[PDB]
Design a binder for this molecule. Sequence first.
Ligand SMILES: CCCC[C@@H](CN[C@@H](CCCC)C(=O)N[C@@H](CCC(N)=O)C(=O)N[C@@H](CCCNC(N)=[NH2+])C(N)=O)NC(=O)[C@@H](NC(=O)[C@@H](NC(C)=O)[C@@H](C)O)[C@@H](C)CC
Lengths: 99, 99
Amino acid sequence: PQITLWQRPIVTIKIGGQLREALLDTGADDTVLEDIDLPGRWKPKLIVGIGGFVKVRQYEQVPIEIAGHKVVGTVLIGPTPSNIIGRNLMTQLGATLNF
Amino acid sequence: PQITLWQRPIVTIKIGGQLREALLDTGADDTVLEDIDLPGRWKPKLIVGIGGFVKVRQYEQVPIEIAGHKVVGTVLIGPTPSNIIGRNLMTQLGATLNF
Ligand SMILES: CCCC[C@@H](CN[C@@H](CCCC)C(=O)N[C@@H](CCC(N)=O)C(=O)N[C@@H](CCCNC(N)=[NH2+])C(N)=O)NC(=O)[C@@H](NC(=O)[C@@H](NC(C)=O)[C@@H](C)O)[C@@H](C)CC
């Protein structure tokens, strides 16, 4: 679809059998979720944003469905004010910004 | 223009006679710059992101040119790892996200 930006660009996601919403964030390199626990091994990772740095868990080769589209990629689990879908997965959707 | 998201979506801006680059951030409500000082009155404002909260200065009715397009809107000045253009100004450009 094509969406304008008068409201926050929020989509539905499915991961590990659970449903959540997430913000499509062109300003995010990576995808970060807070309200999901994933199984198996992970590695510590550090991320930064407006208010400083967060330690998160990095999960690799995670199945995730974003607005209907099934992809597999890296998902970070940790504190964030909002679940966010970053460019790592938006590239898999063929997303573009148009102005 | 139409841009893909394999790299960070960075554009050139002109504000208060100075040139800078900034990230087009669909995950940002507001526009936040770090490397510019603006004149006149301002109000304190609190913003949040990954990591936490930041106090910034809110400047209203600021002329800013974004990738060639002249707009006037609110600009926040404060700490950020990157200058960012948020939806307040991206809506003035008629920006859309497409997939
Ligand atoms: C829930 C929060 C929504 C996402 C967040 C994403 N913004 C970017 C801005 C990037 C410039 C700093 C960000 O954190 N991106 C991260 C996300 C994490 C991640 N791993 O993807 C990033 O790519 N970080 C890279 C590094 C970017 C490095 N940048 C640099 N060095 N210049 C990384 N690997 O850690 N939006 C915000 O952080 C914005 N906040 C808002 O929009 C909030 N609204 C208010 C009014 O505060 C709202 C959430 O409630 C900012 C702009 C104020 C309007």
